[PDB]
């Protein structure tokens, strides 16, 4: 049968786990099967900058950008359940890609 994959991305892990609950709950309430939130490896982008505006090349500050990832695979997409997934209100902090 047809399957929908929801890739969820966020910077904070708390927002990502909270929004994986909201989706799983919505799917359970509409009676579909939900494989669940599978945790994918976090992406870490690292930037190194000189602290001073001029000449102090031995003073540096490292910055980080973590992106957390959660895969939610929903089986048995009842068209009511599909409509529900499209009508969930989720924080801007979380990016939702639905396939």
């Amino acid at each position: 049968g047809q399957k929908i994959r929801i890739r969820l991305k966020a910077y904070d892990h708390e927002a990502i786990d909270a929004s994986a609950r909201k989706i799983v709950e919505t799917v359970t309430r509409t009676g579909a099967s939900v494989v669940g939130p599978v945790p994918l490896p976090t992406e870490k982008n690292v930037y190194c900058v000189i602290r001073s505006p001029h000449k102090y090349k031995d003073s540096r500050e490292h910055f980080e950008m973590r992106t957390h990832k959660r895969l939610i695979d929903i089986l048995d997409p009842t068209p009511k359940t599909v409509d529900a997934l499209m009508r969930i209100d989720l924080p801007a902090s979380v990016d939702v890609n639905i396939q």
Binding site: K9, A10, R51, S59, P91, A92, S93, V94, D95
Partner: protein, 208 residues
């Protein structure tokens, strides 16, 4: 360059980002727009007293929350200022905005606003010792405040030799990560140049 910015030091633990969105491809464009917005807002309600700007983005929705000491000047009773700002906002941004002009509960607990208040007094040639002590007393009376530090540096009193003075009351544990430190900085404008006002307000510990 001795002191790490207090906000950035705690940014993952005790304080939170001043803008919420996710974008991969649009990240650079989003930042450019944010720069434009915050420069348009920081040079508009100067005498309104702004503490925070939070920018939320999603699709085309641009939610701008402006925290201000008194919203009276930030919205005329005819909506005049809200309409003017939204006009320049949507113009600049390209999309639709919803100015959620809020207000701050305890103006005198807010380090950015306390910094603005000291700075404006110095702009009105008030003795800097006076303004420092005034801010200290006002903040410490309020219930959350467990300590405050205020620092002013520059040509204080119009002298030719830079002075850097600071007054402190209570605890200000800058090295403690769990300590809730509110930081504010404002640049007072004077006939002899600019003098920088920094305020640290300790409000207790956060465990999460």
């Amino acid at each position: 360059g001795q002191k790490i910015n207090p906000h950035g030091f705690r940014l993952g633990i005790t304080t939170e980002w001043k803008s919420r969105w996710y974008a991969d491809k649009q990240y650079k464009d989003y930042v450019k727009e944010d720069v434009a917005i915050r420069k348009l807002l920081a040079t508009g309600l100067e005498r309104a007293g702004i503490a925070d700007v939070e920018i939320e983005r999603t699709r085309d929705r641009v939610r701008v929350d402006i925290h201000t000491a008194r919203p009276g000047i930030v919205i005329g009773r005819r909506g005049t200022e809200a309409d003017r700002i939204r006009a320049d906002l949507e113009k600049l941004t390209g999309k639709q905005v919803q100015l959620n002009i809020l207000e701050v509960k305890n103006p005198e607990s807010q380090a950015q606003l306390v910094a603005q208040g000291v700075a404006e007094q110095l702009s009105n040639r008030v003795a800097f010792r006076r303004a420092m002590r005034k801010a200290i007393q006002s903040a410490m009376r309020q219930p959350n405040v467990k300590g405050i530090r205020v620092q002013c540096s520059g040509r204080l009193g119009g002298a030719e030799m830079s002075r850097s003075e600071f007054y402190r009351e209570g605890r200000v544990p800058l090295h403690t990560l769990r300590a809730d430190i509110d930081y504010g900085l404002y640049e007072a404008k004077t006939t002899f140049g600019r003098i920088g006002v920094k305020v640290w307000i300790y409000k207790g510990d956060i465990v999460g």
